């Protein structure tokens, strides 16, 4: 059962940015406490999995939007905005995209993969626009996800292998043409550490924007840990923000490295407070902060963990109180 009378989390940040959460379509019924926590605390929603490539086009031409639409319907019912995650990724993407259809032992050509990417992107954006029109809650999409490797080079996924480095620009071009009202984001992890990957993201977006690619923002996943350095996060936000693009914290959670002790929860509270003070200070750049999961019991991190503001019993943790 949830605490109904404590402050609605997002309301604390109404003069800063929307506070969202990634959800599962099976946790949206009125009588479900996870759904109750969702509607109470967040004014933005993201599909944890239902809008990924495999979730939307499992086999070629066979689009499965029911779960995604259920989440959209819920967002509309609760006056929430949404982020669309994600049009291209190297995980949770069906193998068929990359296969020659006449000979599945061989790879698709650059032209075929680009056409499939265009058809997927266009169908996905046209689906939400035609089904929901002006009520579509999605304000932007993670057009590409995790396209850098951890050394800052372009990740050598099948997209890069078959098409070449311009596949990124093409994804943005296709998305922009399908729905110019959508804000387009490039999303990634570890770019908050002010290391080689942060520099690589800055370099890549600088290059693509100067070439006219319609990139509107950079999504920083923010899968941080109990040991993360706030100074590095601040430096990363400043560097990326200098490009004149929006910054969104897209998948926030805190890896506790197996220590879920009460002492660790207090340390987590101090770190989350510093993190949100930083986000507030950077409100001129940050346009959304989204948690990757509603409560600890449904976090994607392996156990044991305690990554979020609500615990495995759906109760507000010390970090929640520290922030509000
Ligand atoms: O249910 C999990 C999802 O939570 C997970 O989502 C990933 C998390 O890492 C990044 O934020 C990425 O962009 C998200 O898509 O994906 C695996 C799935 O089993």
TrEMBL record:
Residues 3-324 form the GH10 domain. It comes from the Bacteria. The active site is at 251 (nucleophile). Belongs to the glycosyl hydrolase 10 (cellulase F) family. This is Beta-xylanase. It comes from Thermoanaerobacterium saccharolyticum (strain DSM 8691 / JW/SL-YS485). Signal peptide: none annotated.
